[PDB]
Design goal:
With 114 residues, the protein is an alpha/beta fold. 21% of the residues lie in helices and 39% in strands. It comes from Lactobacillus acidophilus (strain ATCC 700396 / NCK56 / N2 / NCFM).
Length: 114
């Protein structure tokens, strides 16, 4: 797995102050712990449940899981335009409106509602 972020995607991640964070790319079928198709989850430390590194030449610490990698594609590109993050590969568009979520916040709320 490898990925590249366009200039607009990089700028955006920067405006959101998360380009330097631990990023987790996963499918969001409502079943994972980081729910709310794909989304970018950011953390401050690595999550052992998502150990697989997605190679890139932009120094981005981005990960995924063995389960999520089967739905990702070869030579992925993350772009930003029309106000949304979009993920694609050599096979085509994967998701034109990728969401971003604060991982810790997600878990915290998950815990409190319970």
């Amino acid at each position: 797995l490898n990925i590249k972020f366009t200039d607009n995607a990089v700028d955006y991640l920067k405006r959101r102050e998360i380009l330097d964070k631990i990023l987790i790319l996963i499918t969001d079928d409502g079943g994972g712990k980081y729910s709310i198709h794909f989304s970018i989850i950011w953390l401050d430390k690595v999550d052992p449940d998502y150990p697989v590194k997605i190679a890139n030449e932009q120094n981005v610490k981005i990960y995924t899981s063995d389960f999520d990698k089967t739905m990702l594609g070869p030579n992925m590109v993350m772009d930003y335009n029309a106000g949304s993050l979009s993920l694609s590969s050599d096979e085509g568009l994967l998701d034109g409106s990728v969401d971003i979520g604060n991982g810790a916040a997600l878990l915290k709320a998950n815990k409190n509602v319970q």
